[PDB]
C-alpha cells in the first residue's frame, strides 16, 4: 500500500483505490495502473520534474528502503501477478530489487522529489509506475 499527496491529489495505483477515490475521481489508467482522487487537505509531496534513472524506493515486505537504478518510463510486458493478467502496462520503469504485491504504493524518490510508486514485482525486478509526466498535479 501507498499513495502521494500532492496539492489537492491523491495519487494511488488503479487497482488499490477505494470507493471514496472512485467518487472523488480527477483521472485513471488501467494501462498506467494509477488513480488520482481529489482531497480535501493540501498534501506536501513534491513531483520530481527530471529523468533521473537514480534514486530509493521503499519495500513494505522487507521494512527497508533500497537505492536503485531505473529504465525511463517504457510500455513493457507484465507477467501475471495476483492483481493483474500477463500484459503491457505503460510508463513503467524497472529495477533491479525486491516486490510483492503487498510492496504496490511504495515511494520511488530522487534528488528532485517523488518519482512514481510500486506497482509490479517478480523474478527479481521492482516497476515502478511513473509520475513525472503528469505536470497537472502541480496546478489546479
Ligand atoms: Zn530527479
Not at 44 to 63: E, K, N, P
Not at 66 to 84: G, N, R, T
Amino acid at each position: 500500500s501507498g499513495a502521494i499527496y500532492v496539492g489537492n491529489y491523491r495519487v494511488v495505483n488503479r487497482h488499490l483505490a477505494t470507493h471514496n477515490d472512485w467518487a472523488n475521481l480527477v483521472w485513471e489508467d488501467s494501462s498506467r495502473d494509477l488513480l488520482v482522487s481529489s482531497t480535501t487537505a493540501q498534501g506536501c509531496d513534491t513531483i520530481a520534474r527530471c529523468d533521473c534513472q537514480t534514486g530509493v524506493y521503499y519495500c513494505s515486505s522487507r521494512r527497508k528502503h533500497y537505492p536503485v537504478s531505473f529504465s525511463k518510463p517504457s510500455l513493457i510486458f507484465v507477467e501475471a501477478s495476483e492483481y493483474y493478467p500477463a500484459r503491457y502496462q505503460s510508463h513503467l520503469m524497472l529495477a533491479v530489487g525486491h516486490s510483492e504485491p503487498g510492496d504496490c504504493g511504495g515511494i520511488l524518490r530522487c534528488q528532485h522529489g517523488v518519482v512514481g510508486i510500486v506497482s509490479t514485482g517478480g523474478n527479481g525486478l521492482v516497476g515502478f509506475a511513473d509520475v513525472r509526466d503528469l505536470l497537472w498535479l502541480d496546478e489546479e
